[PDB]
Design an enzyme around this catalytic site. Sequence first.
Site, mmCIF file in Angstrom:
data_model
loop_
_atom_site.group_PDB
_atom_site.id
_atom_site.type_symbol
_atom_site.label_atom_id
_atom_site.label_comp_id
_atom_site.label_asym_id
_atom_site.label_seq_id
_atom_site.Cartn_x
_atom_site.Cartn_y
_atom_site.Cartn_z
ATOM 1 N N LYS A 11 0.820 -1.187 0.000
ATOM 2 C CA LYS A 11 0.000 0.000 0.000
ATOM 3 C C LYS A 11 0.874 1.265 0.000
ATOM 4 C CE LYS A 11 -4.160 -2.008 2.088
ATOM 5 N NZ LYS A 11 -4.899 -2.272 3.377
ATOM 6 N N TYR A 51 -11.989 -3.134 -4.478
ATOM 7 C CA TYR A 51 -12.670 -3.233 -3.197
ATOM 8 C C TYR A 51 -14.181 -3.364 -3.340
ATOM 9 C CZ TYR A 51 -8.347 -1.927 -0.746
ATOM 10 O OH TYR A 51 -7.060 -1.888 -0.254
ATOM 11 N N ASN A 114 -1.975 -0.185 7.155
ATOM 12 C CA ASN A 114 -1.463 -1.510 7.478
ATOM 13 C C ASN A 114 -0.545 -2.056 6.384
ATOM 14 O OD1 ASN A 114 -3.420 -2.059 5.566
ATOM 15 N ND2 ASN A 114 -4.509 -3.605 6.788
ATOM 16 N N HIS A 117 -1.658 -5.392 1.436
ATOM 17 C CA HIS A 117 -2.930 -6.056 1.184
ATOM 18 C C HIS A 117 -2.674 -7.465 0.668
ATOM 19 C CE1 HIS A 117 -6.727 -7.110 -0.919
ATOM 20 N NE2 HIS A 117 -5.863 -7.594 -1.791
ATOM 21 N N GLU A 128 -8.139 -11.028 -7.919
ATOM 22 C CA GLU A 128 -7.320 -9.821 -7.804
ATOM 23 C C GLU A 128 -6.148 -9.850 -8.777
ATOM 24 O OE1 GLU A 128 -6.404 -9.521 -3.568
ATOM 25 O OE2 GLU A 128 -8.509 -9.249 -3.058
#
Lengths: 152, 151, 139, 152, 150, 152
Positions: A11, A51, A114, A117, A128
């Site tokens: 990220k 998402y 965080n 992913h 994905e």
Amino acid sequence: MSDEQTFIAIKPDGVQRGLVGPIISRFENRGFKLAALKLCSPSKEHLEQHYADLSSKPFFPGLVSYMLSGPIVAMVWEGREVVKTGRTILGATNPLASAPGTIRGDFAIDVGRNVCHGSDSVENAKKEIALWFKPEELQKYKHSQFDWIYEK
Amino acid sequence: SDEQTFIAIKPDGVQRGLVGPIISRFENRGFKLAALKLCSPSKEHLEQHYADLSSKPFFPGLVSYMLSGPIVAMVWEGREVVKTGRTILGATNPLASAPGTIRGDFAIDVGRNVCHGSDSVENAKKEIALWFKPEELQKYKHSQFDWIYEK
Amino acid sequence: SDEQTFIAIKPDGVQRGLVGPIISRFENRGFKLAALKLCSPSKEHLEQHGLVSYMLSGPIVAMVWEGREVVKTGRTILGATNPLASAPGTIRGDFAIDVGRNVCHGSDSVENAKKEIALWFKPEELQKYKHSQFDWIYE
Amino acid sequence: MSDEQTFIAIKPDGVQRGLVGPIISRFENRGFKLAALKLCSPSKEHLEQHYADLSSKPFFPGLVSYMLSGPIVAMVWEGREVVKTGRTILGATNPLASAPGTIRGDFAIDVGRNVCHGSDSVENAKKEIALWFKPEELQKYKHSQFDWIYEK
Amino acid sequence: SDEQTFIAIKPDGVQRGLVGPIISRFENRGFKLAALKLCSPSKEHLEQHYADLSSKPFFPGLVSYMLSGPIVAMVWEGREVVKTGRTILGATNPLASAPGTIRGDFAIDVGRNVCHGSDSVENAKKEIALWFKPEELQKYKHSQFDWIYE
Amino acid sequence: MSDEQTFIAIKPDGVQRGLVGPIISRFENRGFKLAALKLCSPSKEHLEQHYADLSSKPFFPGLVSYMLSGPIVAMVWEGREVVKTGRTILGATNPLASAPGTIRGDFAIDVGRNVCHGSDSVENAKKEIALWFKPEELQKYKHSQFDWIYEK
């Protein structure tokens, strides 16, 4: 099977905090094979499709908006049970619930920062992988150490 | 500073599991990752890349070894990054390289010297144009720019 | 305590360049290297001890580590026998995937350790010295 | 030339200070092959013959007693130009003349506690390997990554 | 032996998370950590530290950047630690530093060279007295002394 | 809230085994801010008030005397849930019960030699911080990467 694949994205905060190399090495050291890698800045519409399973929830525009803050490193790692073992390496989605030794356990604090992913499942992984990479970007090659990493 | 250079991890670097450590050296130095991809370029692509060696005798051997596995192409950006990258990578021959450089820590043979790096600013521009479409270059400001640079 | 355990780096560990990192994890924890050797054992030196066909495919590093509760802690450092069940931070949790390529072996008990140690080492190979940091490591 | 061998020993200070793993890693990471390895405690007569070319030097008696002060990790490493490359990895005999990134430049201070021994030539290396290892201790195998390390 | 040197992690080094790694380089080498603190010195303190450079035109900018964030000040003890402390840091201009050194590993601009090190045994004595009180200098025998020194 | 604080001290075994750097790294890398740092050799009465709730219990005069055997690195670390996450980073009080990847599970063996002290609660951290540090030793500055670490 040994050709199972999973999707990993560093990220924007992972990239901005200089965690590209470390995150790559955790997967390299474990024996997984790097099948695809790119630094990219996806479209909002891309991220909205990524998402889309969270489109109904209140944090969705903010998640997508955060994820446009800078480039992301998209990766495919290949190996036996890599999706589940990928999830174990990343640690829990909430870094404060992660074990030291995992990526989020070593480097992150907030769920919204965080750093990484990971797919939730083989199913999601194939979804994905297909979204973020063209088939030509997936590299077909045999791991030089294959026979020392796998018995079958 | 906006200077860019082209670093490729060669097939031996990828197959020997060195992608992460090589990237770390550049991240840790303060340089900014402007482009990254694992690719398998065509034979013609590598001949264009190594055109300055078209006449020499090792050119066919070099091109085919470069065809032997995926390559990690990268653009790194920072002040004096092309001269400094050559220093991080170490001497072209790994046995002439100091410990603490990439080839000094990881490579032995010049034909398995794990990394390619541009030898000049002009050549870096040519190699970045050759390996990357302009939309693959990322434009962002490094989060620690003013802690890395005075001007 | 001078309790010992037997740790082996299997040929996949050696061929994958994991000798250094595996030794460092026992070193950094405060255990004492009591014996160390790279060897290629006999097929019979191994049946008192695809599996055995591969236990011969390359050199093995054989080790004795000395310290308090080293046999139980050694298993903890190594992690679960099956890497896909072992935590990141363990040797197998950081480096292995398949149980048949699980990088290393360690004794399963303090008395099996004594037996495994007498099988792989002659008593003259076992070193007897005092860890330079013993009093900072133990009370 | 790809199977040149060299003798590296971790001196008793290197062992007592916990540098066994990190030293073995520098050689491993560089592509050299571990051909022999043992923790041993050589006799005084052993060490004096090992250092026979310096028996006339004033430091020789202290050199030997220090070399007796604790167990030694003896190793053989194999690769192209490994004896000369190993000297460079080790760094200057005097650590204060040694560049950071070498073993002695990272880990040592005194010439008399310089953590490591490495042979000073190919022919001298052969003599030292024969001195410290029997033929049966030298492992013969192909390094799993040979063709990525060397072009031969 | 027991010669001392002054090393400071400058605000850029602290702010980029380099405090662990810089300390490890001295620790791993065998030098002994005599004193250590994270502090924010006054303008006057920093001007005195850099006194021999009042003449130069970068002095006021130097001072203010050294004020821009907290600083980790240290004293390292060991044989020729002053000179060796300088080799570990590298050339003050990072682009002249070799990989393996702190500046050659971590830094680019000389104005952001993550670390200050005394240029001299004498100047180390000054800087140590400038930055630390006697009570802050620890005196203890390194647990590995006899393995580090002849 | 992101300005929470915890007290972490590296015990004399920690300092003497060369673990100052690796320990500070664990917290730096996670994204916590170093708010105070000092190498000190506390008085016995100081150390006694630090463990004042174990004044009666039998550990005390031995625990106190060992905490006096060498200098201590006192620290304050700041971040969201830093006191609870600091305990997780340190591992269990008995190093043999803590998992690898924590400080004690990577570096320690004996509970009386567990390299590190960390406060047991937010409240005890406040008390312990005020005891070991002068208010002016607490540094107030904004982490350079606060917005990449926290979503606040």
